[PDB]
Curated annotation (Swiss-Prot):
GO BP terms in the entry: anterior/posterior axis specification; apoptotic process; cell division; centrosome localization; cilium disassembly; G2/M transition of mitotic cell cycle; liver regeneration; mitotic cell cycle
Gene name of this polypeptide: AURKA
Protein name per its UniProtKB record: Aurora kinase A
Effect on the protein upon substituting residue 79 to A: Reduces ubiquitination and proteasomal degradation
Residue(s) of cross-link: Glycyl lysine isopeptide (Lys-Gly) (interchain with G-Cter in SUMO2): 132
UniProt-reported outcome of changing residue 148 to N: Abolishes cilia disassembly and kinase activity
Tissue: Highly expressed in testis and weakly in skeletal muscle, thymus and spleen. Also highly expressed in colon, ovarian, prostate, neuroblastoma, breast and cervical cancer cell lines.
Boundaries of the shown chain within the full protein: 127 to 389 of 403
Amino acid sequence: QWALEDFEIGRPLGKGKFGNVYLAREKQSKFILALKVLFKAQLEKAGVEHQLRREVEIQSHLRHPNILRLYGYFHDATRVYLILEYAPLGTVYRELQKLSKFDEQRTATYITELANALSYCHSKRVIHRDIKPENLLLGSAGELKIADFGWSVGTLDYLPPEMIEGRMHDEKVDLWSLGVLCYEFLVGKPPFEANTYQETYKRISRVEFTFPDFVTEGARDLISRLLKHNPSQRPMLREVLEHPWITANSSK
Ligand SMILES: O=C(Nc1ccccc1)Nc1c[nH]nc1-c1nc2cc(C[NH+]3CCOCC3)ccc2[nH]1
């Protein structure tokens, strides 16, 4: 359907191994969006084309206020293009670097936004597995929007013990993540951060994390509950939504 001569490319939005994303405007519509630009070259080099049109599939058939709309796609000779919803306020990552850490009410809000988002996906039997801040865009409202689905069905920091060890994994993975994310939001760095892959593997495996003093009790409560070694003991997104520190602090 869409070609490249339908668009006016604008300021670049991002880098990344496979190419760039650019702000762009749909010529006949004046519509604003992001163009992710990827090569038929580099795709088949670091072989992933499977995962691609999977992401294409998944982020397509999906609809939710906290999932980045994917509108479409197209390739030429040299490359493949992704027509994305554009998210004004950039990444949760950058806001973090900027603020170095978020307050409880912010954290909690995101968590909800995130929970529900995750909820919709689980409802449609989709697991994301890679919900890192880098992957979390912000809408005009400032609302969590979840990009990327390359690994929807590398750094370990966000992976749970099952995945890391090589074992059987179901949708509970995302609850581990939500826990990590949650910890990161509040503390500024993730609970299992190491200087090497190897240390991280162990730290994660032994679920070794600690809290700085300023972490309110209820926070600890929720993260601990989410960061259980055993998938089974992990809350339900429901309970997560219904947690008393969530609902006491979630502005949304
Ligand atoms: O696909 C990516 N991929 C991607 C590439 C690089 C970084 C993040 C995402 N990004 C986007 C998809 N839709 N909208 C975006 C988007 N990227 C943005 C970047 C900025 C600039 N800055 C980034 C750091 O945080 C502050 C803002 C602003 C708004 C944006 N919307």
